Assembly symmetry: D2
Homo-oligomer: 329 residues x 4
């Protein structure tokens, strides 16, 4: 059973090779992006493994199907790049990773908090060059601060437990509260009260019609002046455009993003040789109190191993006719 990987990185080959010790599939790693003019590379390959920056619109799917590809395996949770209606029409099933490792993602959120708080990215750049001066690097103790967790699913809960260990006072909002958050010392309250009370707000709720642009100009103006916002959830949870004016005024003190609404078109590529087209992202990137990582929150060895194991298992399952993590239109 042969699998062609498009948009391959060294960390993909390393994780999938190790995970393949219990499958023995024939793995082919192509660096190029999948798109109309590279689809031909998948000719004769039964399975193609794609990431979110690969093009799986109707024209590409038609070409893969005509070329004899029988399964599209996404080594991602997200699938915005896939025309699912077209894949169904073509009889080409799509599988994916249902969720990323909660420790990897929650740890990354905490890392964004600490780097922003202690200005560690700014310090590094100073000391690397022999600037040992400390002006502007003063932070705040996390101990005693109010940390508001929006969405208390697995990642939010994991994040909450870590922040509880720093001695933070935990606040939470979820449509369906759970007792585990309570056992950590967490207090549930209304979203609006969470936003007004929290020193640090971290988004971990699913994206739905109800949470789309949850943090918009109104929600930003509800927050405590100078507060920190972290979004490792999904880009569309926030209206990035509204973050700018809040950062300019000082209303928002800090921002840590691991996701961005336009990301599948932007992230996972070195675009440094060319002007950045997106005015909003370009402006965010400039601020001294903003750190953006390029959907890096699941980028640990363990979390990548989970993605590889899940994806290879999904493929074995399709092979046997077991509906496992299929995405349907």
């Amino acid at each position: 059973m042969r699998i062609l990987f498009f948009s391959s990185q060294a960390y993909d080959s390393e994780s999938f090779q190790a995970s393949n010790h219990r499958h023995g599939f024939e793995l082919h790693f192509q660096q190029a992006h999948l798109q109309a003019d590279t689809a031909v590379l998948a000719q004769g390959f039964e399975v193609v493994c794609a990431f979110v920056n690969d093009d799986l619109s109707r024209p590409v799917l038609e070409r893969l199907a005509a070329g004899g590809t029988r399964l599209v395996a996404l080594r991602s949770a997200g699938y915005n790049h896939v025309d699912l209606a077209a894949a169904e029409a073509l009889g080409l099933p799509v599988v994916h990773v249902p969720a990323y490792s909660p420790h990897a993602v929650a740890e990354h959120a905490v890392g964004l908090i600490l780097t922003l708080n202690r200005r560690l990215h700014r310090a590094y750049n100073r000391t690397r060059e022999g600037d040992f001066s400390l002006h502007g690097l003063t932070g705040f103790d996390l101990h005693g601060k109010r940390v508001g967790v929006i969405g208390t699913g697995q990642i939010g809960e994991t994040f909450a437990r870590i922040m509880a260990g720093f001695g933070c006072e935990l606040l939470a909002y979820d449509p369906y509260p759970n007792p585990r958050i309570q056992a950590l010392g967490g207090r549930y309250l209304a979203l609006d009260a969470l936003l007004a009370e929290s020193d640090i707000v971290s988004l971990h709720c699913p994206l739905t019609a109800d949470t789309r642009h949850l943090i918009d100009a109104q929600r930003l103006a509800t927050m405590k002046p100078g507060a920190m916002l972290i979004n490792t959830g999904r880009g569309a949870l926030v209206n990035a455009a509204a973050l700018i004016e809040a950062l300019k005024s000082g209303q928002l003190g800090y921002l840590g993003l691991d996701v961005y609404e336009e990301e599948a078109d932007i992230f996972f590529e070195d675009r440094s040789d060319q002007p950045l087209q997106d005015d909003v992202l370009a402006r965010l990137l400039s601020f001294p109190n903003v750190v953006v990582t390029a959907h890096q929150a699941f980028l640990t060895r363990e979390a990548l191993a989970a993605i590889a194991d899940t994806t290879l298992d999904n493929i074995a399952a399709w092979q046997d006719g077991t509906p496992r993590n299929r995405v349907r239109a």
Copy 2:
């Protein structure tokens, strides 16, 4: 009426000491310049001088301050290596200090250094800022499940241990005098050399003494787990920096986070970027991709600075009432 001249003043000194002064009403003067032989004259007529660790308090400077009518040297620091204490005692010029820094500020800084090294956040930032959204080389490791060795389980080491326990780390500890709080966190005490061999991350928090001087030397680095992370927020002389180089070059030491460096009082707290760095060892450390150095920044939070100011102004008030506190 107390008048206090601060040398080597930063905006964060002025802010914190002004706020602490709410319950004292001292007359505070903030001079940016360093204290040294030729700036001591600025302290002319000031009965208290407030100094940081990079200020020069050798005999010639003390003797000039005393002649100029200075009667107390207040250090807004725990450290005092720059003070000739014998010469101060000889002159009857008492020297007061801050006994300890905020344990939450310092332990949280150590955890930040961990996370930034693990997730390569400093490297990521510099990519993304320039539109490089590629992720090669940035892969880290989950902290959950890893073994974290705490060397020195005083107040800061204990605070650090609690935090790391909340990540779901397995805690190892070494201290000549173990305590039960570490135990209650799930921590296991063991021999120093066994801690070093087993730990994925090692963090130094023990006091510097003749026994702990160069505790991490080339032999101890070789005893560590290949690829391990070392964090030193304790004291520069706990580590033999020169040995760290070869360990980093070979990959034996996977990561290094330093907030302190041996003789840092000569290097840190100044922008030296306009000139060659004379120290070959520090220059080499700075340019590895898996080393982050902060310039004794671990107590640099608003709350930790407020504690330093409150303590220092209370030290000054106590000296004024004829019952000195925190003399060295």
Copy 3:
């Protein structure tokens, strides 16, 4: 006995003015702080105040200086936008300046900006410093053979033209009053719009006047050769910065080097890195990969600074002898 207080002082001011003072013996005082309403009091009892372009010389500040006994404002700059001149004349407080900067310093800076953009030297440096010795994206172009358009052929434009002729560039020029020296270099005069369409590199050196204000606006940018390089070391208001953005985004403008920016006196000459930059247009320009901005640094050589100091101290001596020079 002349006493002079300098506001907004840099180490390079102190060095150059101390050396120039060899033939004057004035008493020089260097204050780092900016001049403004609440620091004017520092000039109390000083008969001359020496200011740079970022110092505040609006009426309230002038009126305070005059009351405090200041009798001359000496600007260590050619520009004076920060001075309320009417209010100074009303107060009988004369204002002197430096007429022009060193043409070699400024033209050489413009050529440096060219070369750094062409060869991506700033980008290269940041790679190599971190051990990235890969060359993708750094390919430049030979200057030899290229068309270089000089807009304004005064002293700086002429000096710039000679340098670029030595690279084997083909020189184009626009000036309302052409001169024969440009010709002797091999330069061709032509219409402004024709210069812009033909030139691979365009450099601004003309005076700012009602006619040249926003000389490079969106229409002129569209007339330029696709992919061309623009250099502005002249004056910020020669260009409509806001138009440069869309031109850079589309690739119509291939490169941009700025040493000046409209209203720079509010932005430049200070480390503002600790705070958000409020100016959306400048923030956008800063983050393109093919834009380099220097902060009005084009006269920042030792020799050009010596000329500024020599001129300023001679302006002060001339005012002292009752025969003022370089009054505005």
Copy 4:
């Protein structure tokens, strides 16, 4: 006629494709380095095109020859990486580019001078982050300064003419002086007097047993205190180790390198993910008054076009039996 390129960069494909409009060769671009375990890719290819970081030691050559490769074309001037004795033994001819574009290289030297003088690399990094302060950025006028050109071959002469246009006073050293340098206003003098008199020294002499380590600790101590040194010639012209102490003491004011003695093992690769092994280079890279480019001096579109034209012409010539730019043991 089929040509396999190892260590291929986008700028190689772009230049060689354009240059191929008068040859019609079949061009294959492989990104991977040539070495023992990638030589197999050249099986059946008559011509292999290599750069200086490719491994052309005996084991690799034997494998190429056994696989039917009949010519090694180096898209470089240098050939240290080639075991020529082994290539001769194997009957595998080697061709190269005799010299790089003199304008490209001399221009790059001038760019290194100006960036160092005006600290433009340091300025960029400040202003990018909103630091508009000018401390430490003061330079010097080039006008009137003494510029010493060591080696007045084509590149040295080209460099000299450019620096003459800035109004510099030109000093020169060459075993075989020429009148063109004189017509520019240049004065020939002894090497030692050049070194003592010059504000800026630029190396453009060939590397030979006599010029190896020409700038060594002795020559550095002959220079004017605070002077600038530029080496775009060859790495081995200088003893890099001796530069360090001179930079530390302030004896050497500035250094611009486009070449380095260990370079074929270091340059042309992104090594930023790993510690740098070379202590000397690592130390040079740290100094605020050192700029190193990674043998970038011929990296212009025109100069790359010349390399491509020359290399394709060399290949056509070999084909016809015309000895053109052959390298012999």
